[PDB]
Design an enzyme around this catalytic site. Structure first.
Site, PDB file in Angstrom:
ATOM      1  N   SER A  82      -0.622  15.464 -12.216  1.00  0.00           N
ATOM      2  CA  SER A  82      -0.858  15.067 -13.584  1.00  0.00           C
ATOM      3  C   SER A  82      -1.103  16.316 -14.414  1.00  0.00           C
ATOM      4  O   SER A  82      -1.637  17.311 -13.934  1.00  0.00           O
ATOM      5  CB  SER A  82      -2.069  14.132 -13.655  1.00  0.00           C
ATOM      6  OG  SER A  82      -2.464  13.870 -14.994  1.00  0.00           O
ATOM      7  N   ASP A  90       0.829  -1.192   0.000  1.00  0.00           N
ATOM      8  CA  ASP A  90       0.000   0.000   0.000  1.00  0.00           C
ATOM      9  C   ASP A  90       0.870   1.251   0.000  1.00  0.00           C
ATOM     10  O   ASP A  90       1.358   1.676   1.046  1.00  0.00           O
ATOM     11  CB  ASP A  90      -0.911  -0.015   1.234  1.00  0.00           C
ATOM     12  CG  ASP A  90      -1.807   1.190   1.311  1.00  0.00           C
ATOM     13  OD1 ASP A  90      -1.924   1.894   0.291  1.00  0.00           O
ATOM     14  OD2 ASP A  90      -2.393   1.422   2.395  1.00  0.00           O
TER      15      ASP A  90
END
Length: 330
Positions: A199, A35
């Site tokens: 992004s 994770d």
């Protein structure tokens, strides 16, 4: 040193991925959920409330000659999806794919929430976010990667998650045969303890690319792709019959649909998520309404590039002094 381990989806939907991890001496192999959005290595154990164990493999520290109780240490974690676990702490030897760390904090669960109990395939979590998020008290502990880093050939790990198929976590090296083209690297902020990056935009299907900054985290422990409501609305508008359902808890679509791809930007590069990666199947057994793999982050408070996005790429988690993230197509 290096390590390399295969990671395997837990079910037919790729809801999560498990990776075998050797703990203790002799080894006790548990299948852990790696994770990158958390920083605790915790396991089901011989100390876990019995009614809360349902099929998981447990760590029994009393059977490990290298286990040592970390005196006074406890831990307690709450995850984004509302699940939780808590307990005490041992140190022990932990190996992943041939890479060994001695003295790793292994957090033994005394209590786990129902979602963990109900998932028999996940024996615990191995956190790969920054150690500043580790919950051990009164002395915070380091992640497996943080402990391994100085011994690694290169201070990196990579995630290569499969779509309905096995994949690989590598530590200490970049497998140049595992991706196509080049790896594009992008800046990371560690301010919130996550692999947080920006992004450069998105496209839906064969549509034009929209240049827009989307700050979010690379999180292997989250199944879906959670993005701003504007972006998600634009995606689902291209699927006939799709709608946001408050009763179901997100966007649903007719199971007869063909889903468009979704592209996200990494600098000037582009990662294309095929439409099929966005299908999470019937909302309930036998339903013709299917659950979407792209969902709104509104009211999460953060955008999350979860498995839906990451499995479309070869992803480099670069833990150099100034961390960065790299993405390649594959």
């Amino acid at each position: 040193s290096t390590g390399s381990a295969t990671t395997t989806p837990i079910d037919s939907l790729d809801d999560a991925y498990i990776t075998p991890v050797q703990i203790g001496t002799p080894a006790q192999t548990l299948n852990l959920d790696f994770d990158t959005g958390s920083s605790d290595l915790w396991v089901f154990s011989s100390e876990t409330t019995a009614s809360e164990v349902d099929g998981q493999t447990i760590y029994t520290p009393s059977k490990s000659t290298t286990a040592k109780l970390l005196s006074g240490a406890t831990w307690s974690i709450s995850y984004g999806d509302g699940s939780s676990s808590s307990g005490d702490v041992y140190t022990d030897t932990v190996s992943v794919g041939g890479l060994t760390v001695t003295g790793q904090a292994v957090e033994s669960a005394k209590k786990v929430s129902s979602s963990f109990t109900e998932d028999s395939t996940i024996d615990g979590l191995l956190g790969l976010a920054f150690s500043t998020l580790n919950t051990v008290s009164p002395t915070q502990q380091k992640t497996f990667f943080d402990n391994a880093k100085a011994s690694l050939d290169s201070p990196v790990f990579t995630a290569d998650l499969g779509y309905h198929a096995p994949g690989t976590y590598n530590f200490g090296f970049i497998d140049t045969t595992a991706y196509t083209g080049s790896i594009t690297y992008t800046a990371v902020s560690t301010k919130q303890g996550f692999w947080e990056w920006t992004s450069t935009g998105y496209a839906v299907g064969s549509g034009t690319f929209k240049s827009t900054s989307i700050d979010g985290i690379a999180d292997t422990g989250t199944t879906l792709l959670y993005l701003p409501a504007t972006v998600v609305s634009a995606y689902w508008a291209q699927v006939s019959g799709a709608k946001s359902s408050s009763s179901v808890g997100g966007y649903v679509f007719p199971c007869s649909a063909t889903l468009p791809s979704f592209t996200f930007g990494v600098g000037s590069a582009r990662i294309v998520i095929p439409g099929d990666y966005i299908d999470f199947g019937p909302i309930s057994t036998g339903s013709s309404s299917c659950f979407g793999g792209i969902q709104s982050s509104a009211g999460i408070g953060i955008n999350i590039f979860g498995d839906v996005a990451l499995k479309a790429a070869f992803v480099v988690f670069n833990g150099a002094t100034t961390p960065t993230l790299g993405f390649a197509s594959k």
